[PDB]
Symmetry: D2
Subunit: 445 residues, 4 copies
């Protein structure tokens, strides 16, 4: 009625109730019907949201994801729930269990990756555990003993297999790997993907989300699905993908995340007396990908650019990803002030028509902006959380506080949507998204 | 470490996480292992705790309980979960499905009842629903259309079958029906229960709670189980129980609760335009059981007494139940002040060694007091909740606030135990008790 | 910015900062410029707001007001600050120090009274004091020993000199005594006030509040000032006022407050062992005025009516005073339900255009409604507080909680205005009003 | 009662009430009786506590302090309230108005300085102002135009007159200038202060704080007062002090604060387009003093050391000043990790006997530790606040949050003491200390 919003305690309660409701036992679905399996970077956020409720169950979430890690170290972006249908492309379409030498045994997974936020969830689990006493500490530490090697293999796979030329940037072979499926970042790269004879399919995502303005188009799905055919034709062989993939881009946002994740994991390794050779490698990669992100940046504004490896051309777009250097650091002082000015000004957080002071996925003044269409404009709580946590780690305590405060105010409707209309605040996409509940739980403390 | 307690938002989150974790689908276990089925007055508290999370799921909890209501109106105190073991006495021991003409079809239940707090949960669901908008209101109101008749039948069964002589007090045939299994209230009545040839059994409750100081003794369980044999021998026939039961007491606390519940349900009936004949009956019963509670009271202190129907004697004990008149009203002004003085003084809430200003189940100065032993002394959050809600309804806003504040401070460890050691605050009994999570969720708002 | 509202801790801090800022030493001004003196019922609310900050200073506030008590027991409505100007009518206009034999020595005061909320403030001080331990309790208890007789003489003067016929209603001789200066309630009584040669004067209130729509008119002020001339002509003699005053009304809202105050004071008197003769008179008055209030009510709706003693007719208006019987109790059950329906429906709190679910001073559907004009429509936090506190005392916990929640939400801009535009929420009148800061402090706890 | 602690809203209210109560009009006293004047770094903290209440009044506090700035740029450590006595040494003892050519006109001040936390207060005022909209921003920005030059001259006088050899450390001539009057840090420098004929005097501090264990000794005060005699003999002339002062130490904690302050002011200067020459000097000073602090540190532990200029030796003590390098940065990675280990281990925050996880002024295991004796062991909320704010600025969000949480928990008794017994939590010294109320206000938000 007069105010549909919840008090902080009611909101924290409903967020926890949602997370437990999406729990299948050892994995949490990313959303009840739209995404009824475990997604890789959602799972890292889910573990962050579970850490204040049960360190034991947070550790189980990451254990389940890492039990699905490929033999070469890749963490796949989907871990399918056994017997669960209603999402396409499903395990039969991927065919990794039959085609991929490196796929895991006794887990069904996708054949592509997703951003490495996992070290950040590990840090949040350890910080919670240290406040809870000896038995909880022992649980977190036993997780580190058991999974430190797997986490190194994950980071080593990204550094060696997706940065073969030691450029300090991660190459993607599918826009889904960026986490930002239909971002304007990838449009010119996708315009050069030409599907051959693509085997028939029917979408399931728009059976659940039926408003066509909130999901990608059929044409885009045709190209997403064709990339799978190219990968399957070389049996997901790392050494053959550069020769056959019609889509090869360096993702500067993914790269900045990895730089931060490496630095975070190195600090964990020093704190918990892990092998010194591992710590040294992690710091080396943190600095390499820091330098690789800075190398992309606009000389006047500091804005970071993606790179089309096939066209050999910088990709200039006005999306939230151009703020990648703020997460990892490395810009000369003057260019970082200009970048912060871009972020806070009327092209992004300071745009006059925004309901909240939050980062829209695409600038509202760009021609590519669509207020409802997924990553082409809507405000995503997950991005708010990540920028706020990274800003606090840069020492920008008031900036991080302001993002948290506006994220909580947006989330106070209790819809736990994945993204929101930037001008009206209408929730969009699936309600009951686990990683939005998790961001709220982490923010509320 | 330095403070093991949780912030209000962390506590609300953990309470909601617990409640969803105990959800089997359409019923919530009272506790994970000790009480792995639905209990009647726990279920009413569970619905109160769910109301701020999901009015739809709160209504489902009460629907599931009422689908197990007996044909004569009795709400049984256990609704067993199909296929679930580990609690004794289980459905085979009760044998209501085969022996009891009035038992429900397609639910397994016990053969005794428990206090009628259900109307209070209905009120809390309606108050939540009215703050949430039209579709949520429609859910609550549709529950009333569907279940008003069942709620009347429940109240009518208590008024006509457990108060056959219109004394305005409820007769119990088992101490389990009071909710206070081993309370000192029932000791002299139980000393006159003599088991005949009692069929062999093994306890399950002390397999889970192994500290013998926190559960009833074998001798007590022998008498609890023998009462079942007396009931089974007359096939749970209402008309035969007065002739065969070795245990027949009027429970003044149960009676005060019923008086309040009748008044609450009458007000609901007027608000939602239910049949006027039903409303008039409810008000008639509210006043009858009010007068029946007052008739028991000590002339100097206002303390309410239970009555042994077989011995025809008043039962004088120093437990929390002697504060029954405060819940329902009816005492002359002067005797109610004396009763409040008893409650707040050094025999109860003002005892100098209590960790919290809360109501111990038995007075710490009584010879019957045992600080660990179930209802013989420990502080129960459920009683705190009930006294605080009833006090607020009497208009004693500061008294109700003080009980809430101390209940939250006791619960801030996040153990959600059913009862606590009164002097040390050590949690006792089962951890993860649903109705303690529910009281916390309701208090926190 | 995006959110001009303050957090609960920021709002409590600002309210306390305001209250200390309006403190002249032993008295607190009602507002810095518009009301730079001590007003009687404002000081009662100020003492309530001070009690969480300093029981000693809260008691000082009531000590200072009672030091200005007249010899017949009347608490005058203004205690003027020595040396302060800028308010009209000031002490020279009242001339009480010259004319009124009953006026106090070494205090300058007005010559009329205001509603008796003081006992309520005493209850709140005592409640706070009992949570703070022994030396704070001594302070509050020493105040009771010091001022019990004065409080008794205040109540006795109301019961005997302003209810000379034992009708259970308080007679007023000025609309200012109601606290609701320009209420539609008094329009037809004021229409029969015809001033003679009125000594010239210049208003000061509208030099500070310059928007003419927020204060009464010059014609209204000419009648206010003429009644002063009538009172001065009989030297404020009680026995002579009925013979000369052109304005004599029974104020049902003032009477309901008095009934409540008497009941509160009687209970205090019992708890602290005051003379029995006093407690008995206080209960007698509480009931007489409860009955006097109910005698005014409409048989169908329960709406309470004021009474014009000179015209000998019921004053039928659509203002918040209609709900007088909800504060003090006493209506038949059906009639009280009808009155709550009026309060919650579209003529008051349910009006669809209201920004908050709060009680407007005049019904938006009444022809008398003026959205900006003082007591002719605006929402006053002081009424919100008083209705909420009295509702909680009736046992209507949820109704009291809703008013408190909407009051805090309206207050959270930090203006601490005395009244707000009902549709837009715009603050009106003076900002920095002490009793609005007090209500916020008491609500926030 | 059972809980003498205050809720967060009650505590914010009481803190704000205290701060307004210590307001003399344009200055706030450090404490009502012990320190009834304006102290320099207290006023910086007071302005931080005022910023959530009134940006205008926060700016007044710094305006008043800067109006007492000496002509050479020095901010003196006391600005005396006109007409107030009860503190010794008072203005007659300092005699600055007579002797010091650089002393201000129409202000009475001391003749020594105190740490430069003022730029930090400026940042907090600006941060608050930017959340309050345009007219509040104008206030803060007009203050910057008014006082930027004065702030520059304050920093320039520190860099040029108290670091005459460009060593990047501040030289002090009195232990009072460190803010840590009786710290063990200065014990061996004070042992070489031998007073001559000292003019008689009577202490006032220990007439108010009478427990001798909470204040320095008479022998200590005789040395404090003798250094005044030395300064007065050269008429507080900067160029002459090195030739005559018996106490000359480089204060590494003061230096670390200055480095931070310079960096803060430089960033403010960039954001508000101050002269480039000024911003460049501020960054130069920030780095010089960062390097000067690191030059003092132990190679294994990172602990920072003070330096006795006269004795020409490092002062090795176990106090909170050792952690100077954590505030300003600059240590090698390994050495900073060792220093955090010292801070968190059993010699400081990890000591098993501490009631709160806070930084004691002197290590409990040091032979110099005295649990009640001022800066020789007690926990000071002002240090908690300053370490927490500086930790957040380093990016150590969780470490800053833990200090804030334990500080609020220690403060929640509402004493607002300046220091607390480290083992029992007993408040010590003066209650009603303004900068403890300020820290609480800033923490609570
Ligand atoms: O649309 C899809 O089918 C998936 C493909 O992975 O993308 C979304 O679904 C995932 C589950 O929420 C998210 O992690 C991604 O960021 C993205 O929003
Ligand atoms: O001990 C048992 O086996 C059951 C019998 O019903 O009693 C407890 O178990 C129930 C489940 O919590 C409670 O409702 C009762 O109040 C009581 O505490
Ligand atoms: O306008 C005035 O001159 C004074 C006269 O008493 O009235 C208001 O001012 C007083 C101080 O706020 C209040 O007690 C009253 O409610 C009233 O609204
Ligand atoms: O004891 C004294 O006479 C004064 C001298 O300056 O010192 C304290 O008093 C001042 C006011 O609290 C503080 O600024 C200092 O930290 C110090 O603790």
């Amino acid at each position: 009625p007069h105010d549909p919003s919840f008090t902080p305690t009611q909101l924290a309660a409903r967020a926890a109730y949602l997370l437990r409701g999406n729990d299948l036992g050892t994995m949490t679905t990313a959303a009840p019907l739209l995404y009824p399996h475990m997604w890789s970077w959602d799972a890292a956020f889910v573990a962050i949201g579970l850490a204040p409720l049960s360190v034991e169950r947070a550790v189980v979430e990451l254990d389940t994801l890492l039990s699905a890690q490929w033999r070469n170290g890749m963490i796949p972006h989907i871990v399918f729930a056994n017997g669960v249908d209603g999402y396409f492309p499903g395990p039969a379409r991927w065919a990794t269990a039959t085609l991929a030498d490196n796929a895991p045994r006794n887990r069904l997974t996708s054949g592509i990756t997703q951003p490495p936020v996992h070290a950040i969830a590990v840090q949040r689990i350890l910080e919670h555990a240290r406040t809870r006493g000896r038995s909880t500490r022992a649980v977190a530490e036993a997780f580190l003993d058991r999974r430190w090697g797997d986490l190194m293999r994950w980071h080593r796979w990204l550094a060696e297999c997706r940065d073969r030329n030691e450029r300090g940037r991660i190459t993607l072979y599918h826009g889904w790997e960026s986490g930002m499926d239909n971002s304007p970042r990838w449009d010119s790269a996708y315009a050069n993907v030409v599907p051959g004879k693509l085997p028939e399919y029917q979408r399931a995502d728009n059976v659940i989300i039926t408003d066509p303005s909130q999901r990608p188009s059929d044409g885009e799905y045709d190209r997403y699905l064709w990339l799978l055919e190219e990968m399957k034709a070389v049996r997901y062989d790392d050494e053959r993908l550069p020769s056959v993939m019609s889509f090869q881009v360096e993702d500067v946002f993914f790269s900045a995340i990895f730089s931060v994740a490496c630095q975070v994991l190195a600090e964990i390794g020093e704190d918990y007396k892990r092998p010194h050779a591992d710590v040294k490698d992690l710091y080396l990669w943190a600095e390499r990908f820091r330098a690789g992100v800075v190398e992309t940046t606009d000389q006047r504004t500091g804005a970071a650019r993606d790179f089309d490896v096939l066209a050999e051309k910088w990709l200039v777009t006005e999306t939230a990803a151009q703020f990648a250097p703020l997460l990892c650091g490395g810009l000369p002082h003057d260019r970082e002030r200009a970048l912060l000015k871009l972020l806070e000004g009327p092209r992004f957080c300071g745009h006059p028509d925004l309901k909240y002071g939050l980062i829209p996925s695409t600038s509202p003044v760009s021609r590519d902006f669509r207020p409802r269409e997924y990553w082409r404009g809507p405000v995503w709580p997950v991005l708010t959380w990540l920028f706020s946590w990274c800003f606090a780690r840069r020492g920008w305590a008031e900036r991080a506080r302001l993002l948290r405060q506006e994220g909580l105010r947006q989330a106070s409707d209790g819809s736990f949507a994945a993204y929101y209309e930037p001008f009206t605040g209408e929730p969009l996409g699936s309600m009951q998204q686990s990683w939005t509940a998790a961001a709220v739980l982490d923010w509320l403390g």
